[PDB]
Design a protein around this ligand. Structure first.
Ligand SMILES: Nc1nc2c(ncn2[C@@H]2O[C@H](COP(=O)(O)OP(=O)(O)O)[C@@H](O)[C@H]2O)c(=O)[nH]1
Lengths: 300, 295
């Protein structure tokens, strides 16, 4: 029985986590870390830590110092976790600076440490994009796996008439997608069981990674969802280059092995010839006639 | 004066986190108080009462001392106060002795719970772990010391080690409070608990669990021999034992467990014995033994 903790650090990460709770992500403890006591009052995370109270504003250095000052505190909150996720929106001060610290503390404790962060949209300014660049380099060193989701690419998906708040709600969703895609294999498996040891085996020290999501209904759903996942703009066409791929397919209890397999086979065929691919399934009884496929691609 | 008022104070990062666990597990019958002692960080809490008085013990000590009146008003009217800094060090280790002294001067039965870190954790300068214990020992009626090293002889990986420490910590409070607050076939008189705990000094704890036939005896045997007890059962002058179980828990089996602790305890020992009804345990029995004093 694995203990999984998901940490949302910074305003973006704390919003992603709330979205995760609101969408019903199960079998994980949620921890919100931020430098603003108000925003935290609003979070529905299980643990809420307010850091850098004296210091405190989009300065990654302030946020690193604020997490580092609270290092013992954070470590006490994490202690006992087999798996730790660190989600944030790269670019600001709290998530950018703080994320690597929370990651390093989890990795030091020997928890499978997975980072799940977004790159800011280009329209947000070259200062943020730069700070996210440095943020992700640091975070990379602290995580077993770091999935980086480029927000610009999210605009090539969903609606073409999306406002600025919906854009960021899509960022929340996709961060949920990345966490759920993995944790659900462990907490609520289907016919094909991929357990903590398995996920640990493929994602330990796998490095930098991208994700692809796809979903569909009705005839040929599993092939359709797999195909969308593998061609996802978030994967940045780098699928056929990946050395390690974890693939999760979720559907109701009625999800048969034939469909599972079809998706699996399509994915294999698009994958690198020497690719280590693990296929797992998820029971999710809320999905109806829909299946969703998540692909995590690493080792380029 | 007739429904024990029990106040559980978690102080510092590790203390509040322990209290939040207690709320999360559904610990009944007690009032929860969260005291943040750090200036730079606040761990939030769903505790009934919260006081933010904010990695040095000295810093915790002063901030607790500065807030002594507020703390005293928070503790006024309690019959029993628990105080813990939980796992990890920090300012809470400094603040704990203060809350404890305030509670004792108010005339409450003051029980501290403290943990000794795993040796693999290393040590921070000035022996501040051992000093936090000595200061808390001077301020408490009874200090329950949990030596985490002993956990690695119970039943272990690193994540289990840490999770076990948290679980036994919660039990250092729940084991005794449940006895007091939650009915069972054999109930205890608070005045007795106060009799064996008042000015008792250091105490150690032992836990045990078993299912099926001979469960009460098996769990009590595990609890009485617990490595956490550091075999202090022999010399112990004051012993509390509690058996938590479902409603069907038989008087005979209950009595066999009580008999066994009496044989194992020192001849001159005070023994307070009782059961708890917890219908969520199923076929399981959980025993807790608190051993205080020496021969
Ligand atoms: N997922 C998500 N990302 C956001 C949200 N708001 C802002 N962001 C992104 O997160 C980046 C950092 O902002 P924020 O997390 O508020 O900064 P911080 O709190 O100082 O780390 C921004 O540049 C955006 O790309 C949000 O509501 N949800």
């Amino acid at each position: 029985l694995a203990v999984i903790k998901v940490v949302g650090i910074g305003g973006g990460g704390v919003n992603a986590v709330n979205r995760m709770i609101e969408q019903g992500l199960k079998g994980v403890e949620f921890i919100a870390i931020n430098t603003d006591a108000q925003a935290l009052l609003m979070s529905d995370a299980d643990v809420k830590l307010d850091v850098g109270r004296d210091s405190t504003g989009a300065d990654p250095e302030v946020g690193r110092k604020a997490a580092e000052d609270a290092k013992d505190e954070i470590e006490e909150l994490l202690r006992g976790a087999d798996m730790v996720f660190v989600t944030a929106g790269e670019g600001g001060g709290t998530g950018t600076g703080g994320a690597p610290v929370v990651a390093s503390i989890a990795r030091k404790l020997g928890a499978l440490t997975v980072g799940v962060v977004t790159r800011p949209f280009s329209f947000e300014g070259k200062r943020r994009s730069n700070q996210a660049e440095n943020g992700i380099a640091a975070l990379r060193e602290s995580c077993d796996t770091l999935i980086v989701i480029p927000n610009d690419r999210l605009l090539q998906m969903g609606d073409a008439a999306v406002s600025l708040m919906d854009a960021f709600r899509s960022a929340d969703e996709v961060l949920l997608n990345g966490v759920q895609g993995i944790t659900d294999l462990i907490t609520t498996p289907g016919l094909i069981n991929v357990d903590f040891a398995d996920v640990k085996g493929i994602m330990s020290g796998a490095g930098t990674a991208l994700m692809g999501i796809g979903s569909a209904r009705g005839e040929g759903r599993s092939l359709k969802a797999a195909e969308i996942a593998i061609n996802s703009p978030l994967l940045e066409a780098s699928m056929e280059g990946a050395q390690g791929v974890l693939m999760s397919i979720a559907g109701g209890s009625d999800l048969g092995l034939f469909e599972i397999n079809e998706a699996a086979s399509l994915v294999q065929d698009a994958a690198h010839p020497d690719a280590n691919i693990i296929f797992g399934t998820v029971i999710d009884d809320s999905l109806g006639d829909e299946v969703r496929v998540t692909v995590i691609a690493a080792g380029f």
